[PDB]
């Protein structure tokens, strides 16, 4: 991956690109399904981490814990 | 000795649940950050020597 094609070589670069280019493959990216996947997968990875840690904690503790007007009726009796 | 590690793991599980929520919260706001654009660089911030 080439570092920092600065701003404006293109007027020359595409002048010199077309002479040597045989096959371009541009990886145009979508944005909305990408963000949907990213947030869902982040929830998935953190939920899987916490599920594993819940199971580990409950088993480890369930194992290690068994091993460890006021003087009327008081004057005549 | 077992009670101490039980307490540590019990803190850790709820801390992990907290982190699981927090990372989603930060990932919601990580999508509204951009490198500031000018007229000389316009966000790329690299120019010819």
């Amino acid at each position: 991956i080439v570092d920092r094609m600065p701003i404006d070589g293109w007027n020359d670069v595409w002048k010199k690109l077309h002479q040597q280019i045989v096959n371009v493959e541009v990886f145009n990216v979508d944005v909305v399904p990408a963000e949907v996947y990213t947030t869902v997968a982040t929830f998935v990875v953190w939920s899987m981490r916490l599920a594993l840690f819940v199971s580990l904690y409950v088993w480890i503790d369930s194992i290690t814990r068994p091993i460890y007007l006021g003087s009327l009726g008081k004057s005549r009796a | 000795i077992p009670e101490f590690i039980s307490k540590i793991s019990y803190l850790s599980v709820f801390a992990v649940a907290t982190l699981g929520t927090y990372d989603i919260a930060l990932d919601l706001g990580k999508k509204v950050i951009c490198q500031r654009d000018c007229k000389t660089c316009n966000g790329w911030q690299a120019l010819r020597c």
Binding site: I1, F27, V29, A34 | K30, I33, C34, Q35
Partner: peptide, 17 residues
């Protein structure tokens, strides 16, 4: 996709992964 390097740098990248 867009990486956030500390001191506030948003770097654009290739497709993903």
């Amino acid at each position: 996709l867009t990486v956030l390097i500390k001191r506030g740098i948003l770097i654009l990248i290739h497709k993903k992964a």
